[PDB]
């Protein structure tokens, strides 16, 4: 299957120049283009450049043509995106995007996204606590159980239980302190509670946090 | 530069009615245009291309229109699990340009919400922090007012909330509020309440616990 | 004439 990987987020200091980078499988880039997409926070899709699988076709949105720079290594079957003078402007998360159509019919990728964040506060990992189940988070034969995710920088943290039943994610929340926090909770049946180990796995990738957590019952 | 003006912003409809967004090209674009539904923390996916081919798996409800300047696309039956932003793109030469994006929601019956409180982990009050939640789940409308009472002490200015994405299944929301006290602060009292109400809610609702 | 397509 056509796979393309995101690798290059992070935090950045603005006036830096970042590369990002997409490795490609499935395909050899002998045909058609490949572009770079942004999104930034809540706001919409944007196209930001395009190269095509011989190198030329180089070419970008307005808002970014005087200082972003598209290329390609076929020997890696790879994209690069280098982004220079960066600014608050350009946090977002970037993916790479390949999309044509022929007689098989339409061909669309994504990748999974990387979000660069420029600013100049420091990396941060976060603390993992459990939100315990009870009495106080019982319906039914259903109790809610989860974690919380707390003061990290930047985004974005994943969460996932029993390493991957009604999970909500709430979004990532900016306090007064500069600092991120978000919960994840699921439901789960009340007469599991004492029988099953609950545990949230939480990755922080920009500061190289791992965290596993039991979630355990409180009278 | 092409410009891809889509309309309206946002859409709040109702299960079953028949919506309609447009897209407008400031140049001629025969019928390279193609429409992507993008959910909160998705890679967006294709649609609909050449303005009215439909993807494979694309329910029938979906359907595109147009050429050259003016495009529609048209949910004849609008469904839960289509609440998302949708964006048109042209795709006349070697880049791309999308509209701005318009954002589908669903208006439903009232739900109320069920209520639940969390509180704080001793691993945390190891830090010197008590971090207090309270849950609501599964309701609609959006807005709610939570108060949280610290031995009936109205709190204001320490807690913040943080709201789901509708659901894909029923279009409600649920909501976490989270209060943050000092530990010296949290072990100083005996009653934490939130108190919640909602259109769903005749009396206000309060989930309580005391501490230990 | 479209370099998307076919």
Not at chain 1, 39 to 55: C, N, R, S
Not at chain 2, 171 to 197: N, Q
């Amino acid at each position: 299957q056509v796979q393309l990987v995101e690798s290059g987020g992070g935090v950045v200091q603005p006036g830096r120049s970042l590369r990002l980078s997409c490795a490609a499988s499935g395909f050899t880039f002998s045909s058609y283009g490949m572009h770079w997409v942004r999104q930034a926070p809540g706001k919409g899709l944007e196209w930001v450049a395009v190269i095509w699988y011989d190198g030329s076709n180089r070419y970008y949105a307005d808002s970014v043509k005087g200082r972003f720079t598209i290329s390609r290594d076929n020997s890696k079957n790879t994209l690069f995106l280098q982004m220079n003078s960066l600014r608050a402007e350009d946090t977002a998360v970037y993916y790479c995007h390949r999309n044509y159509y022929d007689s098989s019919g339409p061909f669309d990728y994504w990748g999974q996204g990387t979000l660069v964040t420029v600013s100049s506060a420091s990396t941060k990992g976060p603390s993992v606590f459990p939100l315990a189940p009870s009495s106080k988070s019982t319906s039914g034969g259903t109790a809610a159980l989860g974690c919380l995710v707390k003061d990290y920088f930047p985004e974005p943290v994943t969460v996932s239980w029993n390493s991957g039943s009604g999970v909500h994610t709430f979004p990532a929340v900016l306090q007064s302190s500069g600092l991120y926090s978000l919960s994840s909770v699921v439901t789960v049946p009340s007469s599991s509670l004492g029988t099953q180990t609950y545990i949230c796995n939480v990755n922080h990738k920009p500061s190289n946090t791992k965290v596993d957590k039991k979630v355990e019952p409180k009278s | 530069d092409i410009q891809m003006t889509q309309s309206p912003s946002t859409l709040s409809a109702s299960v079953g009615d028949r919506v309609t967004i447009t897209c407008r090209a400031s140049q001629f674009i025969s019928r390279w245009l193609a429409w992507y539904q993008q959910k909160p923390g998705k890679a967006p996916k294709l649609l609909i291309y050449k303005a009215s081919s439909l993807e494979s798996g694309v329910p029938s409800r979906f359907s595109g229109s147009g050429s050259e300047t003016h495009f529609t696309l048209t949910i004849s039956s609008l469904q839960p699990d289509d609440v998302a932003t949708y964006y048109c793109q042209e795709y006349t030469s070697y880049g791309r340009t999308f509209g701005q994006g318009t954002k589908v929601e669903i208006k439903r019956t009232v739900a109320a919400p069920s209520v639940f409180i969390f509180p704080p982990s001793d691993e945390q009050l190891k830090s010197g922090t008590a971090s207090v939640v309270c849950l609501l789940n599964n309701f609609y409308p959006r807005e709610a007012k939570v108060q949280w009472k610290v031995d009936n002490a109205l709190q204001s200015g320490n807690s913040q909330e943080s709201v789901t994405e509708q659901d894909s299944k029923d279009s409600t929301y649920s909501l976490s509020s989270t209060l943050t006290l000092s530990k010296a602060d949290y072990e100083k009292h005996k009653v934490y309440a939130c108190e919640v109400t909602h259109q769903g809610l005749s009396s206000p609702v309060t989930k309580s616990f005391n501490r230990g | 004439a479209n370099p998307n397509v076919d």
